[PDB]
Amino acid sequence: ADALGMIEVRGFVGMVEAADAMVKAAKVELIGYEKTGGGYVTAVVRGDVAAVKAATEAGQRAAERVGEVVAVHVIPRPHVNVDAALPLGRTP
């Protein structure tokens, strides 16, 4: 269905700055944050591919001002097994 954008920041503060600049800068929807422990947290946005691809190039230039960014990545199509198994906010 909808696409996927992920920002992984080493620190909570850079993740909140990324997840705020994305929802301000484009028409995306923040739907939660994944804690892995050790210092890494991941903000996850969902929209169509014209939205998250434009939001993450604002989120990454935001989160490279207050901290360290691990791996910005955009998945334009989540497959139904990943969408049903991993906590991506669109699991039915």
Partner: protein, 198 residues
């Protein structure tokens, strides 16, 4: 023969983009098609083996979806890629000339001149046709894309002479080395108007 229209009804989203790829193989060609439809939800128009053994891929979609599928398809094709084409907004008069090789039976009476243009690949033909429609008020009459005539592809525009010369100025630089021969016939005879290929 219904997903080729320039506009959909209200229930369907409008898909103005165009992603075409002409490849020298078919196996890598259809793996390229599979990866392009994996990466983004591109409404694929057609996937067909045209003459001189090439594979012709066309897809509609929104602009970002087709551009995502084109970067994935251009990733997988690199080699067996021959030509590509990505249009953000195809002209409305183009859409009924892609799949069916359509020739015209008769013109209008105020139609003065004609210009016929042939390109070695097919994406050069569609590229130059869509560039020439969006730069001069010409009318596309017929267009043959690599079936029968061994890979090559041509089309003819018509209209007023100044418009077809301006379209010639655009096509002889938008094509490049892929042009073959372009004829600005100023006044075709009454025996040949409207019926050029028969």
């Amino acid at each position: 023969p219904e997903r080729f229209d320039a506009t959909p009804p209200a229930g369907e989203p409008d898909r103005p983009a165009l992603g075409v790829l002409e490849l020298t193989s078919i196996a890598r060609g259809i793996t390229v098609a599979d990866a392009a439809l994996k990466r983004a939800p591109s409404l694929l128009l057609m996937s067909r083996p045209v003459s001189s053994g090439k594979h012709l891929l066309m897809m509609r979609g929104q602009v970002a979806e087709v551009e995502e599928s084109m970067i994935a398809a251009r990733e997988i094709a690199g080699g067996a890629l021959l030509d590509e084409l990505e249009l953000p907004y195809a002209h409305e008069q183009l859409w009924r000339f892609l799949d069916a090789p359509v020739v015209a039976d008769a013109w209008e009476e105020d139609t003065e001149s004609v210009i016929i243009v042939e390109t070695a690949t097919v994406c050069a033909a569609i590229d130059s046709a869509d560039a020439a429609l969006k730069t001069a008020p010409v009318v596309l009459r017929d267009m043959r894309l690599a079936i029968g005539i061994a890979g090559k592809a041509f089309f003819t525009l018509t209209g007023e002479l100044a418009d077809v010369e301006a379209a010639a100025e655009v096509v002889r630089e938008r094509c490049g080395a892929r042009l073959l021969e372009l004829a600005c016939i100023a006044r075709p005879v009454d025996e040949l108007r409207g019926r050029l290929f028969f």
